[PDB]
């Protein structure tokens, strides 16, 4: 089993160390290990080394991703890798495209793209402003529905590489990812139960009569039993969650529908006159 470790920190920083630590836990379990340090990569924003990177990820059996915490979440670069995962890694779309190619004499997309895969995350911060990073990390897995084994947060971690019990946890995380990689079918989540009984998220967006899991999308209700919170939802919802084939198919179906309505609207005069007025009213300023 090949475990790929990826770090988004400074070269030779803590995130590198925690990720190599995990890689060592994986080798202890017999895995072959590799390491990518994202500062060596050129990756543009979602409007160039990205493909190479995705290639490396597709060939791994499990991945361990260690990211710094910036403004409570992952770095902008992690969000950019999440952005660029859409067009390439959505499991619903790649299932559709493989079916359609097979049945229309088209060429078979990358088999690899549809292989099951396990992934674990570590978020390393310098304080306790860390309340959005785990959800950030979950999003990356959600597009391709990789199985999250561990999704750990490390606050007050500027000097983490001399905190032995925490470097130990990182080692344990690499043990787990390698073990999960040995049997991806029967591998099971090893992290914190959280509140969402499905996502395991603790991030909810709250409006009157509707609490929504910020990760899996389930709409239900949050309950406070003497300061302990908990999340219920109608079973029917499970059809719609964003990390299920059912939920993705619907989601895409809605995209194709609304993208049709748009293309048509773009030919109306309402659309064309309004756009023409915008072009006339102002011009975008740019640097010299
Ligand atoms: C621009 C910026 C924003 C940051 N925001 C947070 C934050 O919101 N919460 C937190 O714990 N740490 C934050 N940090 C601290 C970084 O996570 C820390 O420098 C990083 O984990 C170091 O890892 P490395 O050694 O691999 O670079 C921030 C750091 C920078 C540079
Ligand atoms: O080492 C840090 C530097 C900065 C930081 C970022 C931009 C400008 C000046 C300092 O912010 C932090 C925020 C945190 O919650 C935890 C940290 O360890 C840091």
Author numbering: 1 to 47, 68 to 308
Give the published text.
Here, using a combination of bioinformatic, biochemical, and genetic analyses, we discovered and functionally characterized an unreported flavone reductase (FLR) that specifically catalyzes the hydrogenation reaction towards flavones and flavonols, and initiates their metabolism in F. plautii ATCC 49531 as a key step. Of note, FLR and its widespread homologs represent an unreported class of ene-reductases with highly distinct amino acid sequence and catalytic property compared with those of all known ene-reductases. FLR-like enzymes were abundant in the human gut microbiota as well as other microbes living within flavonoid-rich environments, thereby suggesting a broad role of these ene-reductases in microbial communities.
To further illuminate the underlying mechanism, we solved the complex structures of FLR with various substrates, including apigenin, chrysin, and luteolin that contain similar A/C rings but differ in the B ring. The structures were refined to 2.55, 2.65, and 2.25 Å resolution, respectively, which adopt a very similar conformation with r.m.s.d. value of 0.18~0.21 Å. The structures clearly demonstrate that the coordination of substrate mainly involves the A/C rings, while the B ring protrudes out of the pocket. Specifically, the A/C rings of substrates stack against the isoalloxazine ring of FMN on one side and the side chain of residue Ile275 of subdomain-2 on the other side. This substrate-binding pattern may explain why FLR can catalyze the reaction of apigenin, chrysin, and luteolin, since all these three substrates differ only in the B ring.
